[PDB]
Enzyme design. Structure first.
Site, short mmCIF file in Angstrom:
data_model
loop_
_atom_site.label_atom_id
_atom_site.label_comp_id
_atom_site.label_asym_id
_atom_site.label_seq_id
_atom_site.Cartn_x
_atom_site.Cartn_y
_atom_site.Cartn_z
N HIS A 77 -16.97 -0.83 2.09
CA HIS A 77 -16.96 0.62 2.26
C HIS A 77 -16.25 1.34 1.12
O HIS A 77 -16.09 2.56 1.18
CB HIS A 77 -16.31 0.99 3.60
CG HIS A 77 -14.85 0.64 3.69
ND1 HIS A 77 -14.05 1.10 4.71
CD2 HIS A 77 -14.06 -0.12 2.90
CE1 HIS A 77 -12.82 0.64 4.54
NE2 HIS A 77 -12.81 -0.11 3.45
N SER B 92 -7.38 0.44 3.39
CA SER B 92 -8.83 0.35 3.21
C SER B 92 -9.20 -0.78 2.25
O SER B 92 -10.09 -0.65 1.41
CB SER B 92 -9.40 1.68 2.73
OG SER B 92 -9.15 2.71 3.66
N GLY B 93 -8.52 -1.90 2.38
CA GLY B 93 -8.76 -3.05 1.53
C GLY B 93 -7.47 -3.79 1.25
O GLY B 93 -6.50 -3.68 1.99
N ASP C 89 -18.68 -6.18 6.26
CA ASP C 89 -17.93 -5.26 5.42
C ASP C 89 -17.22 -6.05 4.33
O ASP C 89 -16.04 -6.40 4.42
CB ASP C 89 -16.94 -4.45 6.25
CG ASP C 89 -16.30 -3.31 5.47
OD1 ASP C 89 -16.73 -3.07 4.32
OD2 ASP C 89 -15.38 -2.67 6.01
N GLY D 153 -4.06 -0.02 6.64
CA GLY D 153 -4.62 -1.21 6.02
C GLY D 153 -4.98 -0.97 4.57
O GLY D 153 -5.46 -1.88 3.88
#
Ligand SMILES: *[C@@H]1O[C@H](CO)[C@@H](O[C@@H]2O[C@H](CO)[C@@H](O[C@@H]3O[C@H](CO)[C@@H](O)[C@H](O[C@H]4O[C@H](CO)[C@@H](O)[C@H](O)[C@@H]4O)[C@@H]3O)[C@H](O)[C@H]2NC(C)=O)[C@H](O)[C@H]1NC(C)=O
Ligand SMILES: *[C@@H]1O[C@H](CO)[C@@H](O[C@@H]2O[C@H](CO)[C@@H](O[C@@H]3O[C@H](CO)[C@@H](O)[C@H](O[C@H]4O[C@H](CO)[C@@H](O)[C@H](O)[C@@H]4O)[C@@H]3O)[C@H](O)[C@H]2NC(C)=O)[C@H](O)[C@H]1NC(C)=O
Ligand SMILES: *[C@@H]1O[C@H](CO)[C@@H](O[C@@H]2O[C@H](CO)[C@@H](O[C@@H]3O[C@H](CO[C@H]4O[C@H](CO)[C@@H](O)[C@H](O)[C@@H]4O)[C@@H](O)[C@H](O)[C@@H]3O)[C@H](O)[C@H]2NC(C)=O)[C@H](O)[C@H]1NC(C)=O
Ligand SMILES: *[C@@H]1O[C@H](CO)[C@@H](O[C@@H]2O[C@H](CO)[C@@H](O[C@@H]3O[C@H](CO[C@H]4O[C@H](CO)[C@@H](O)[C@H](O)[C@@H]4O)[C@@H](O)[C@H](O)[C@@H]3O)[C@H](O)[C@H]2NC(C)=O)[C@H](O)[C@H]1NC(C)=O
Ligand SMILES: *[C@@H]1O[C@H](CO[C@@H]2O[C@H](CO)[C@@H](O[C@@H]3O[C@H](CO)[C@@H](O)[C@H](O[C@H]4O[C@H](CO)[C@@H](O)[C@H](O)[C@@H]4O)[C@@H]3O)[C@H](O)[C@H]2NC(C)=O)[C@@H](O)[C@H](O)[C@H]1NC(C)=O
Ligand SMILES: *[C@@H]1O[C@H](CO)[C@@H](O[C@@H]2O[C@H](CO)[C@@H](O[C@@H]3O[C@H](CO)[C@@H](O)[C@H](O)[C@@H]3O)[C@H](O)[C@H]2NC(C)=O)[C@H](O)[C@H]1NC(C)=O
Ligand SMILES: *[C@@H]1O[C@H](CO)[C@@H](O[C@@H]2O[C@H](CO)[C@@H](O[C@@H]3O[C@H](CO)[C@@H](O)[C@H](O)[C@@H]3O)[C@H](O)[C@H]2NC(C)=O)[C@H](O)[C@H]1NC(C)=O
Ligand SMILES: *[C@@H]1O[C@H](CO[C@@H]2O[C@H](CO)[C@@H](O[C@@H]3O[C@H](CO)[C@@H](O)[C@H](O)[C@@H]3O)[C@H](O)[C@H]2NC(C)=O)[C@@H](O)[C@H](O)[C@H]1NC(C)=O
Ligand SMILES: *[C@@H]1O[C@H](CO)[C@@H](O[C@@H]2O[C@H](CO)[C@@H](O)[C@H](O)[C@H]2NC(C)=O)[C@H](O)[C@H]1NC(C)=O
Ligand SMILES: *[C@@H]1O[C@H](CO)[C@@H](O[C@@H]2O[C@H](CO)[C@@H](O)[C@H](O)[C@H]2NC(C)=O)[C@H](O)[C@H]1NC(C)=O
Ligand SMILES: *[C@@H]1O[C@H](CO)[C@@H](O)[C@H](O)[C@H]1NC(C)=O
Ligand SMILES: *[C@@H]1O[C@H](CO)[C@@H](O)[C@H](O)[C@H]1NC(C)=O
Ligand SMILES: *[C@@H]1O[C@H](CO)[C@@H](O)[C@H](O)[C@H]1NC(C)=O
Ligand SMILES: *[C@@H]1O[C@H](CO)[C@@H](O)[C@H](O)[C@H]1NC(C)=O
Lengths: 603, 235, 232
Positions: free
Chosen positions: C48, C185-186, C92, C183
């Site tokens: 994402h 996002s990665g 993902d 998190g």
């Protein structure tokens, strides 16, 4: 004729300009050669300038998959006052179709449009020149291409209805993004990323096939302002009602407001919503009546991640607003902040009461716990804390065991984290159990028997008059302060030599205890070696000069002698000639002195 | 934090660093051949499994742990003073047990415990050791930092910081105008005051309101009342 | 003013990827995502994070201060799994090919590819630009890295309302802080020396109950190998 690196010459070869200024829609070469079609090798279509009222252009390798990475860009120019309306037919591609469309040329090319993985649809730009740029995401054979057409029309013949009515099926229709904010809108089809925020479907079509606009879904961690502007609206003899649907999903949604700006600079706000309204499209309705031209501006304040705001189904009608069929939106209720201090619960844990049970041990305990249990027993008893099951998180929540019976508590041990834990034995009849936890991610907890009695946890004393160490082992005779090793703890070699009738921490008479009898030492064969041996037995440093005073000890003094094996000889015999008790003095150990090679710079 | 200065190698052999999980979490002081003295606030809940604590004696540079003068060691037993309460913020002193023993190679030496009938008048500059930062919320410096602060009596400490009860079991230090402190950044470690011949363990670095704030002295553990408790793990 | 705490407690936060050389950052004008350095020429991150322009930073210690140990590599190639849905966060995971070979040093290193998926209780290291403070209203410049165990698959699936697929598992919690560390996002999620998660999503900013969702790359190691072989 040569040019500096990063710059390219023109056809006339009279000056050098930056290569990025070529084929950008703005004339930079003195002869105007930078906009020439032949110089601007589009490769995708073979034509760069589209100055007519209609035309078409194609991407590279339209009928077959392409294996070459070529950057393509097109410029379309029409007469002033005409609006260019774009159209697209095929964009169903697994990305690799990044299309950049910008209104005008120059500094306006920032965040006008960036479309990929979806059909751009009908796009209208209210400018004389339109900058269309195609960027390849990868050179892998997974893309086909596209071919688009355009047309021009009078942009000033539009009425107030067309300038506002837009279901966002095809771009922004007749709307122009703002330029006074940080980041602008973008086109999104279907559900957005970052679950629990942003719309999951389009309001106009009802499912994921629809087209709309929203704030960018990029996982940013900064606050940005997003604004949308509208075309000027001519004054009308009848007031107009504005109908729009706004989606505000996200725990970080700050504010969505609308500002109306006219020629009189009387900016006012007629619509304003704050907070999170859930994944529901909310209908908006305002009434506007201005005697002069005015513009409708959609102002959206975007916070950090999970603050998405969406707009769809914007239209303008005539007359006074009617009854709103859709009622006012409802805010998502916040968690109750009513007294999150503590729960208290079982303040006292004593008596023959059964095992502790909080009625929520399997699931979770209340957060921010500060409760106490107070384990009490009869006089002369102790407390044993045998755990049944222990399960906690990482090191932020602890379990405290205290045995002070009062404010002057005696901490015993701290237990936290998953896994089995050892039992706790107190020294008094009152044990204080404290459970301090954080405000997030409570665990199951712990349970205990709290059953005890008389002297539980203390090892049984040794028999046969045997010395007992810390581990409880037997030391009858062998390891009685004689430089041996029996117990693992090493307490069998406790210091049996101490100063007697002394004055300071290192000055005093010699006192010895071989096994169980305290006695002094004679001065018949005392020497420096014996002095340092006693220093080691006393836990001090190097020996110091000493002087005898008087034989004041008539008991069984021990005679000290040196041995070749390094062990001091202790003879408990009253045999000495001209006895005189020695006031032994030993220097301190090697303390914190700066004995390292330390030097200073003489400058 | 601002206020400290780089310390010469070997100038403070008794200052050692404590690592938990590979990160510099606490600092300790050597007092014997197998035991250390450190603040009890940093062992609050990490003593159930005495295997993740690594003690680095003779540490001067965090990014360098290969010199023969520095002997890494593991901690197998950690004890906490029972009088610690975490609410009165008193008796925050803890001790750690080394693996087998320690050597003395002119860079790992034990600190001198306070003696009986010792007088420590306020106002004298007592050295403070620790790995401070460059700002209030920075990162621990790769070079051990040294600074001097004047001793402050317990009477004025309560007036300067009404939020803390202080009590006679804790001794404060700091400046009237501030600017030099070690309240934040790391555990700090031992408080050292010199006496011509023997660097005495003047205190153990403890909690504080905020560094460099005027009229906000840093709180230190009074080792003079803990001498008997410390003198129970010595060879 | 005691913003974070009045005692010498730091929470054990890692000192700028100390002894964690398998963390990289993705930049597009600002920090938005992160990943793990699987090998000298490839990185693994959640799918994402796709952007038009991505800049890969290796061994980043401070967001603003550069220590000279950071390597900036442009995203030469960006490829995502063909089965990655734009609406459903299944699969993902994405791969970004570094335009230049990574430099191995004390703060930049590769990570071994997993050979067997852990079940539960395995210690994991998760790196992300979270909140390295107890409380406040500012974004800290430090880099957060907190250890985390492995939860059982059944519990992770049952906790979410049917939002967990066969390739998702719960790893990290990251409690405390101002609004938790989320998190990021990665970022790398390496368990027992094996990269098991790439941080997919979560219920809010790790408020409670469900802190986040991680993508298991053990089901995509074959696809990663195929992509590496195809792109050399
Ligand atoms: C694209 O189409 C638009 C159509 O709107 C065109 O803009 C102008 O539109 C108006 C109305 O359709 C045209 O008529 C003018 O309306 C304004 C409104 O305030 C009047 O003030 C003007 O008055 C003129 O004529 C009067 C006699 O009737 C005079 O007394 C007076 O002094 C003025 O001279 C006028 O009625 C208007 O003509 C057009 N604009 C032009 C330049 O024709 C727009 O121009 C079109 N785009 C292009 C590139 O042509
Ligand atoms: C949309 O339009 C509305 C107006 O309808 C506009 O609202 C503005 O809100 C602010 C409050 O947030 C109003 O108050 C201003 O607040 C600023 C905050 O710093 C003050 O500095 C302003 O004071 C100035 O003017 C004083 C004299 O009146 C000076 O003495 C002082 O030193 C400042 O220079 C002011 O009090 C504000 O009045 C309105 N209206 C405006 C700004 O026109 C809102 O901002 C608009 N939103 C968008 C996105 O355009
Ligand atoms: C949009 O439309 C609105 C309504 O159509 C507009 O509201 C107007 O606002 C102005 C003020 O700016 C009003 O002017 C005032 O009118 C009162 C009325 O008093 C008289 O009332 C009756 C009318 O017959 C008369 O019989 C009495 O004897 C009074 O003399 C005056 O007292 C004030 O002094 C002032 O002039 C308008 O009345 C009002 N409109 C209507 C229809 O009421 C609005 O301005 C429009 N624009 C915007 C941007 O909202
Ligand atoms: C183990 O400990 C538990 C406590 O954590 C015991 O539960 C009960 O907890 C309450 C909490 O205060 C204790 O306090 C007593 O409450 C009673 C309530 O009695 C009510 O009913 C009588 C009529 O029978 C009425 O007259 C009262 O006004 C009340 O309306 C009070 O009467 C007491 O004075 C006292 O305040 C209880 O002592 C405690 N035990 C009970 C209720 O049996 C739990 O019971 C304990 N386990 C065992 C096996 O005893
Ligand atoms: C999500 O929902 C979509 C929505 O279904 C499609 O809706 C559109 C419009 O809402 C339909 O388009 C029109 O449908 C009518 C009725 O069938 C048809 O007559 C129209 O044809 C006219 O226009 C064409 C040019 O477009 C012209 O050539 C014709 O001669 C005629 O004049 C027009 O097609 C569309 O038909 C619907 N789709 C279907 C299959 O009926 C669904 O399509 C998706 O499956 C849903 N799910 C997902 C995941 O997207
Ligand atoms: C402290 O360090 C020393 C060395 O760094 C550790 O080993 C000890 O080293 C000394 C050397 O000065 C040994 O003494 C000599 O040993 C040799 C061995 O052949 C012997 O031939 C000599 O006559 C002399 O005795 C000493 O024995 C050795 N220690 C042991 C247990 O063998 C030492 O272990 C470290 N730790 C301490 C002293 O606690
Ligand atoms: C113990 O430490 C304190 C604090 O560092 C010392 O007191 C003060 O230290 C400052 C240094 O920051 C001195 O400031 C300097 O003063 C001189 C004038 O004397 C001036 O010219 C400089 O520009 C600078 O401002 C300050 O004078 C000093 N105060 C006193 C009363 O001495 C203190 O000296 C230290 N103790 C010992 C024994 O060194
Ligand atoms: C609270 O204590 C509970 C006590 O555990 C019990 O201990 C007795 C010991 O006498 C066990 O009896 C044994 O039973 C064996 C047969 O299963 C015999 O062979 C043996 O000789 C002896 O009689 C008994 O089984 C055991 N359990 C029970 C349920 O009584 C303990 O069980 C709880 O876990 C503990 N709770 C805590 C620590 O939270
Ligand atoms: C034994 O101790 C005495 C002190 O009680 C030492 O005498 C002094 O020691 C200091 C060392 O700090 C010297 O500076 C002095 O010169 C010594 N003499 C006097 C008169 O003060 C004595 O040196 C010690 N003996 C040994 C062998 O070290
Ligand atoms: C905080 O300090 C105050 C002041 O010393 C304490 O109050 C005294 O405590 C002692 C011992 O507990 C008592 O003998 C005194 O009677 C108390 N009052 C006074 C006026 O001295 C207090 O106990 C401390 N702790 C708190 C408040 O929790
Ligand atoms: C693009 O080319 C195709 C030929 O395959 C044609 O059918 C289509 O109409 C073209 N698009 C436009 C907008 O003309
Ligand atoms: C409001 O109601 C009237 C009643 O006839 C209707 O004509 C009109 O279309 C409705 N909507 C408006 C005015 O926007
Ligand atoms: C020690 O001092 C006391 C009192 O000064 C005295 O009674 C005693 O005899 C002394 N000890 C010896 C061994 O003389
Ligand atoms: C690391 O570098 C310092 C710098 O002077 C040096 O003194 C030391 O010996 C080196 N090795 C270590 C600390 O292991």
């Amino acid at each position: 004729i040569e040019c500096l690196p990063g710059s390219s010459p023109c056809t006339d070869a009279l000056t050098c300009i930056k290569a990025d200024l070529f084929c950008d829609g703005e004339v930079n070469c003195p002869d105007g050669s930078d906009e020439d079609n032949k110089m601007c090798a589009t490769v995708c279509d073979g034509r760069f300038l589209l100055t007519g009222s209609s035309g078409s252009f194609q991407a590279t390798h339209y009928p077959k998959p392409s294996e070459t990475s070529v950057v393509c860009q097109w410029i379309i120019r029409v007469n002033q006052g005409l609006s260019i309306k774009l159209s697209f037919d095929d964009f169903n591609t697994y990305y690799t179709d990044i299309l950049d469309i910008y209104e005008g040329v120059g500094s306006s090319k920032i965040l006008r449009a960036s479309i990929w993985e979806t059909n751009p649809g009908t796009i209208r730009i209210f400018s004389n020149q339109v900058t269309a740029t195609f960027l390849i995401e990868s050179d892998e054979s997974d893309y086909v291409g596209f071919n688009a057409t355009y047309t021009a029309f009078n942009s000033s013949e539009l009425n107030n209805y067309e300038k506002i009515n837009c279901n966002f099926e095809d771009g922004f229709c007749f709307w122009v993004q703002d330029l006074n904010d940080d980041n602008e809108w973008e086109r999104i089809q279907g559900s957005t990323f970052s679950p629990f925020t942003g719309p999951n479907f389009d309001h106009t079509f009802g499912n994921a096939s629809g087209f709309y606009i929203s704030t960018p879904t990029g996982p940013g961690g900064r606050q940005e302002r997003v604004g949308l502007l509208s075309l000027p609206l001519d004054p009308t003899l009848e007031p107009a009602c504005l109908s729009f649907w706004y989606h505000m999903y996200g725990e970080n949604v700050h504010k969505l407001s609308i500002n109306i700006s006219n020629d009189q600079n009387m900016e006012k706000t007629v619509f304003q919503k704050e907070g999170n309204y859930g994944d529901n499209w909310n209908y908006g309705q305002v009434t506007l009546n201005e005697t002069v031209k005015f513009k409708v501006a959609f102002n959206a304040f975007k916070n950090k991640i999970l603050s998405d705001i969406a707009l769809d189904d914007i239209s303008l009608t005539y007359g006074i607003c009617n009854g709103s069929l859709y009622p006012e939106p409802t805010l998502v209720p916040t968690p109750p902040p009513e007294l999150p201090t503590d729960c208290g619960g079982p303040f006292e844990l004593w008596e023959p009461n059964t095992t502790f049970s909080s009625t929520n041990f399997p699931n979770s305990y209340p957060n921010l716990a500060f409760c106490v249990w107070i384990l009490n027993a009869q006089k002369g008893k102790n407390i044993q804390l045998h755990f049944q099951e222990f399960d906690l998180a990482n090191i932020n929540d602890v379990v405290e065991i205290r045995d002070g019976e009062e404010a002057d508590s005696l901490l015993l041990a701290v237990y936290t984290g998953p896994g089995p834990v050892k039992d706790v034995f107190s020294t008094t009849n009152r044990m204080t159990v404290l459970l301090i936890t954080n405000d997030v991610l409570a665990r199951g907890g712990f349970k205990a028997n709290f059953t005890t009695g008389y002297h539980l946890g203390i090892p049984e004393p040794c028999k046969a008059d045997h010395f007992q160490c810390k581990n409880g082992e037997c030391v009858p005779l062998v390891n009685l302060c004689d430089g041996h090793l029996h117990c693992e703890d090493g307490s069998d070699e406790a210091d049996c030599v101490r100063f007697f009738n002394g004055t300071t921490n290192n000055n005093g008479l010699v006192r010895f205890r071989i096994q169980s009898i305290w006695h002094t030492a004679c001065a018949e064969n005392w020497t420096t070696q014996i002095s340092n041996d006693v220093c080691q037995l006393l836990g001090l440093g190097s020996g110091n000069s000493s002087k005898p005073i008087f034989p004041t000890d008539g008991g069984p003094f021990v005679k000290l002698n040196t041995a070749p094996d390094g062990h001091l000889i202790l003879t408990p015999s009253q045999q000495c000639l001209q006895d005189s008790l020695i006031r032994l003095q030993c220097n301190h150990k090697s303390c914190g002195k700066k004995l390292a090679a330390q030097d200073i710079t003489p400058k | 934090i601002v206020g400290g200065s780089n310390a010469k190698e070997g100038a403070w052999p008794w200052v050692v660093g404590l690592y938990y999980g590979g990160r510099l979490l606490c600092g300790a002081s050597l007092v014997s051949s197998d035991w250390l003295v450190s603040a009890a606030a940093c062992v609050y809940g990490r003593n159930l499994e005495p295997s993740k604590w690594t003690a680095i004696l003779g540490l001067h540079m965090k990014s360098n742990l290969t010199s023969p003068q520095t002997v890494p060691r593991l901690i197998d037993e950690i004890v906490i003073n029972p009088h610690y309460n975490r609410r009165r913020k008193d008796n925050a002193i803890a001790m750690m047990h080394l693996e087998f023993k320690v050597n003395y190679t002119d860079y790992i030496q034990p600190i001198c415990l306070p003696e009986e009938n010792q007088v420590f008048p306020p106002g004298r500059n007592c050295s403070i050791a620790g790995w401070g930062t460059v700002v209030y919320q920075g990162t621990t410096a790769n070079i051990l930092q040294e600074a001097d602060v004047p001793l402050l009596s317990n009477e004025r400490c309560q007036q300067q910081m009404p939020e803390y009860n202080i009590t006679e079991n804790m001794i404060c230090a700091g400046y009237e105008e501030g600017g030099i402190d070690s309240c934040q950044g790391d555990a700090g470690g031992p408080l050292m005051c010199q006496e011509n011949n023997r660097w005495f363990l003047a205190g153990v670095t403890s909690f504080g309101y905020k560094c460099a704030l005027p009229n906000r002295p840093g709180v230190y553990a009074r080792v003079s009342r803990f001498t008997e408790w410390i003198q129970s793990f010595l060879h | 003013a005691p913003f974070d705490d009045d005692d010498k407690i730091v929470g054990g936060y890692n000192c700028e990827e100390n002894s964690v050389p398998y963390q990289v950052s993705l930049n597009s004008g600002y920090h938005f995502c992160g990943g793990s350095l699987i090998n000298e020429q490839w990185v693994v991150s959640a799918g994402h994070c796709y952007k038009s322009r991505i800049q890969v930073r290796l061994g980043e210690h401070n967001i603003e201060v550069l220590e000279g140990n950071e390597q900036f590599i442009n995203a030469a190639k960006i490829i995502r799994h063909p089965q990655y849905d734009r609406k459903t966060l299944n699969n993902d995971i994405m791969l970004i090919k570094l335009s230049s070979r990574a430099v191995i040093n004390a703060r930049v290193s590769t990570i071994s590819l997993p050979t067997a998926p852990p079940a539960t209780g395995t210690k994991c290291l998760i790196s992300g630009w979270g909140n390295t403070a107890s409380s406040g209203a500012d974004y800290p410049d430090e880099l957060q890295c907190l250890d985390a165990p492995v939860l059982s698959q059944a519990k992770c699936e049952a906790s979410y309302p049917g939002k967990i697929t066969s390739n998702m598992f719960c790893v990290g919690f990251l409690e405390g802080g101002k609004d938790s560390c989320q998190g990021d996002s990665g970022g790398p999620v390496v368990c027992n020396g094996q990269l098991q998660g790439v941080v997919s999503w979560g219920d809010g900013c790790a408020q409670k109950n469900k802190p986040g969702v991680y993508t298991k790359v053990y089901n995509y190691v074959k696809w990663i190998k195929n992509t590496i072989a195809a792109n050399s």
